[PDB]
Design a protein around this ligand. Sequence first.
Ligand SMILES: NCCNC(=O)c1ccnc(-c2cc(C(=O)O)ccn2)c1
Ligand SMILES: [Cl-]
Ligand SMILES: [Cl-]
Ligand SMILES: [Cl-]
Ligand SMILES: [Cl-]
Ligand code: NA
Ligand code: NI
Ligand SMILES: [Zn+2]
Length: 353
Amino acid sequence: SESETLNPSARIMTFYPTMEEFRNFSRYIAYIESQGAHRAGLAKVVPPKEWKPRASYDDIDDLVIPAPIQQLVTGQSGLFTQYNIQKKAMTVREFRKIANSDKYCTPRYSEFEELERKYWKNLTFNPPIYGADVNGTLYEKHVDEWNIGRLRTILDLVEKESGITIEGVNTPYLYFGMWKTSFAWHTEDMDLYSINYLHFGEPKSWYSVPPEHGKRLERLAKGFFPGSAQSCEAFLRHKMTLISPLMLKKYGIPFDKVTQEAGEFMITFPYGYHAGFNHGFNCAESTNFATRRWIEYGKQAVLCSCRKDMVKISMDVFVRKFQPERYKLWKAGKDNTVIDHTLPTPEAAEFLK
Ligand SMILES: NCCNC(=O)c1ccnc(-c2cc(C(=O)O)ccn2)c1
Ligand SMILES: [Cl-]
Ligand SMILES: [Cl-]
Ligand SMILES: [Cl-]
Ligand SMILES: [Cl-]
Ligand code: NA
Ligand code: NI
Ligand SMILES: [Zn+2]
């Protein structure tokens, strides 16, 4: 009850931490969960005014985007599938020139609702190029607060114990966007948390479905794409499936929307389905992270069964370390723990006493 009493509408919450609160990353995540933020699947955190991860973005035009993606989208009536066409490597300068050309630039509009309508109307036309999945960080080597390259959560246990790195998951990715570039409906690999910082440029808009209603979204998607569902136990993980908010509304799927501006963080939570699009030229940085609450999600995540090189993290070391009394039962396939999506991570205890 107690946890199910906080953020009962499961709406997207927005936080404005002081510099003092801001400093301890995992602690602040535990705090925002004590306020019910995770129930939405997504939350915005606006960093203290005097915080900056970089002095200047003037020196990056020569940065290479090795695998720009042209996003072809096919579909109608609010349901689309996106196909990636990889283009030749190009520099940020070359990307921005294209993003801003008349051909690819943001269309005119007054209110967000209008840009949003244009997005869903023109999604299948004039396929844009997304400078996605660029290995690297734009953080200055000395920034200690919310440094996407070193958040210091328990996800570090993966590399620490095995030496394994998974690009964009326990290392940072940069995303250079232009108008109408998209991210399909998905939860994170292994149902992890993610953090996304918009370094600069035009806004990135998001949609989110509360984890407690995640299964309803999957049921709907299966119905809409039965062929894909037959071929894979988790086809949404291909990140190719776009579904408009009008379709979600028409089929009773709860969801919220939020627009992220330059200088703002978005946090997605385990099993929070999210999707969205960029307004124009921008650059975001992101990676995954964990809390103790994630471990159970990791154990129960339903993974892509059809592709080679899909992301899978061995849960063994987390279960041994944080759930030793359940280890044997788990290895014996008898762990029937049921996840309660409303419960905050146990590190939040101190904010709840
Ligand atoms: N292409 C393979 C590598 N992994 C992914 O595509 C992936 C995984 C999880 N989240 C995302 C994601 C992207 C964005 C963005 O493009 O702003 C926003 C929110 N989530 C992307
Ligand atoms: Cl706040
Ligand atoms: Cl299908
Ligand atoms: Cl795709
Ligand atoms: Cl998977
Ligand atoms: Na890569
Ligand atoms: Ni994501
Ligand atoms: Zn698959």
